[PDB]
A paper describes a structure:
As a proof of concept, we used this platform to identify both known and novel L- and D-amino acid peptide binders to the well-characterized model target, streptavidin. All peptides bind within or near the biotin binding pocket of streptavidin formed by two surface loops [1/2 (amino acids 22–28) and 3/4 (amino acids 42–52)], and by antiparallel β-sheets involved in an extensive polar interaction network, in which residues Ser88 and Thr90 of β-strand 6 play a major role. The surface loops of streptavidin are flexible: upon biotin binding they undergo a conformational change to form a closed conformation, but to accommodate the peptide ligands, loop 3/4 is dislocated by 13–16 Å from the biotin closed form to adopt a well-defined peptide-specific structure. All eight L- and D-peptides discovered in this work bind to the same pocket of streptavidin in distinctive binding modes suggesting (1) the rich malleability of L- and D-peptides and (2) the ability of streptavidin itself to adjust the flexible loop to accommodate multiple peptides with diverse sequences and conformations.
From these “secondary” peptide families identified in the initial screen, we chose three 5-mer “hot spot” sequences: LAEYH, PAWAH, and FDEWL. We used a series of array peptide libraries rationally designed around each of these sequences to successfully evolve the three sequences to 12-mer L-peptides. Strong correlation between specificity in the substitution plots and co-crystal data was also observed for the AFPDYLAEYHGG peptide (the highest affinity for streptavidin in SPR measurements) and the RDPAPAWAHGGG peptide (the longest stretch of highly specific amino acids between positions 2 and 11) (respectively).
Numbering used by the authors:
A (entry chain A): 16 to 134
B (entry chain H), G (entry chain F): 2 to 12
C (entry chain D): 16 to 135
D (entry chain B): 15 to 136
E (entry chain C): 15 to 135
F (entry chain E): 1 to 12
């Protein structure tokens, strides 16, 4: 149920393959979907989850460098996939910037996001 | 911004 | 700098390769060294960091399933590599368990850890 | 300030808060979830002179999960901002720390996000 | 409770707190220098009847970053536990939220950790 | 009981 | 800085 395309509320577009080995691989891009906005992601998921309606645990990372831009930062999303007619990936994220040691205290933002199968 | 805003829905 | 064997202060052993393409791959295992405690990791790092003394941003994930065990959970680490005489990776982590909707509010633990290349 | 009132989070918890002129938050919290029953005391702080550029009002508060009915040996802090206008909201992140042994300290702290409004959602 | 008094982080940032029989934490947080422009009100709560099984004492507090001199339009909460014994400590994780516009709300909240001891470094 | 291996998270 | 750095273990 994870493999495919997912959208946040802004329409940002997460394109992922969930491999039989537990790998997540894909790309994350803006709603516009121009090449300058596209970044690689990789992660892992529970390939033998509960079958009782519970979510499937997963996580992935994007480093914010592509062939066009580099923000010197990386986001990780930790969350769970819930299937069915109204499938969701519910996440919390940590965004760490590369900083000097003196600025490390303010290096990591926290937030959340929800992805759905339709815009 | 420290990364693309579009990629980060809720704070 | 990132490629190598890293340890936390419990001797948990993080064996990672930092690829030319920004990939992190490797394994994470307990100090006991047994196969049942070894898990796959994958992640990403900034392959063209600043050169002004700033750290190198990176993150990775372990799903807590291997050939032997499954906790139905996954951890992500977000942080930075800090080079120099004693290189270090400083991280914050989020550990999410698969849960029912009713228990989703308590699905995620948060913490921190730091790694060096010096076996404790 | 717009903060004083009765608010509900997305889980149906009830946050009854008063904002003081000096930056104080006081009131009670009743959780719809967890090892909790009835009301608990809260205290916290808010920015009593927020920016005039459209920004939200920063705030935070704490509940220790002890009352005369039960003691979960835990405390939650919510850190967030109040956003006024058409549909007033308090958007927060929270940390729930339990008292643990040193060996279990690694799993002491849950994290999440709560959004509070004047409506009690389904 | 063992909490009342002065606590220091590794930089010598200094909070002075009273932990009442009422479960209240009240006090001030200031820099190692301790000039008035650095001092802010601290308010929070703690478990006044902790477990007796070798567990820490849960607590939390908030500082809004406004005083008579400055206003950063932000607030930090610390959530953690007090651990008594030979080298007493308060171990925390913190969330710092800035007041932002809606467009910037995604980057409103920083997360970190800090540990406090009774001995000024 | 633990939700994941404690050693991995700097604990246990 | 979004708040005093010293208060957060930094600067
Ligand atoms: Na499960
Ligand atoms: Na309380």
């Amino acid at each position: 149920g994870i493999t495919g395309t997912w959208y946040n509320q802004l329409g940002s577009t997460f394109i992922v393959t969930a491999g039989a080995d537990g790998a997540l691989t894909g790309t994350y891009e803006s709603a516009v979907g121009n090449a300058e906005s596209r970044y690689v992601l990789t992660g892992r998921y529970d390939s033998a989850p509960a079958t009782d309606g519970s979510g499937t645990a997963l996580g992935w990372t994007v480093a914010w460098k592509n062939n066009y831009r580099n923000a010197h930062s990386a986001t990780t999303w930790s969350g769970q996939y819930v299937g069915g007619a109204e499938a969701r990936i519910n996440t919390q994220w940590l965004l760490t910037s590369g900083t000097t040691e003196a600025n490390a205290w303010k290096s990591t933002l926290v937030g959340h996001d929800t992805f759905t199968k339709v815009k | 911004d420290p990364a693309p805003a579009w990629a980060h829905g809720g704070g």
